[PDB]
Design a binder for these strands. Structure first.
Length: 138
DNA sequence: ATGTACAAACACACATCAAAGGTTTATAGATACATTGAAACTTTTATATACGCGCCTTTTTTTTTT
């Protein structure tokens, strides 16, 4: 966690699974340890980071990533709490925007590359195949 | 005349002393287990809250011999 602290506190945010890949922490000993730790400094006293690191993991040009910052922020800004650990609803912006482009990143390839449920995608994409109205920049 | 068994030098052949060193092993360093008690550890639950995932469980599709 002090890494996840040290990471996020250094303005680089990584998912719990990502560190879990580095160290298997039973995903639970992580959580309780984090809460105290954060409050350790508070007494001693940001999911945006995920959009680009994902695009590169798929090897995409900047525009597809460029757009998602607008889309995810705009999808976040109005409504759609949408997600229970917004890690997922980040990726759907790529999926939203990758389909706005025509580049083969077929859902199955997305999943294992980013180790995400496929179900959260399409249902997450439900709120997108309907919200396709206001993301028109050009 | 006359040299011979006998025992003293007189410098030496002979038994002794002494440094060195492999080998053995208690003896100890360090070693790897063997003990155990002790506290750091596990469990319910239900309880809604809002998740999945796999597995309970099932419906629809899928496949060899006479």
């Amino acid at each position: 966690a002090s890494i996840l602290i040290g990471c996020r506190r250094a303005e680089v945010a990584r998912t719990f699974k990502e560190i879990q890949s580095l160290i298997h922490v039973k995903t639970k000993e992580f959580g309780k340890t984090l809460n105290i730790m954060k409050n350790i400094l508070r007494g001693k006293s940001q999911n945006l980071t995920y959009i680009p690191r994902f695009c590169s993991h798929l090897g995409l040009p900047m525009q597809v990533t460029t757009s998602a910052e607008y889309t995810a922020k705009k999808c976040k800004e109005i409504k759609e709490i949408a997600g229970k650990s917004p890690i997922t609803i980040a990726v759907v912006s790529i999926y939203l925007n990758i389909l706005l482009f025509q580049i083969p990143i077929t859902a199955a390839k997305v999943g294992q590359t980013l180790q995400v449920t496929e179900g959260t995608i399409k249902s997450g994409y439900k709120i997108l195949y309907e919200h396709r109205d206001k993301l028109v920049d050009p």
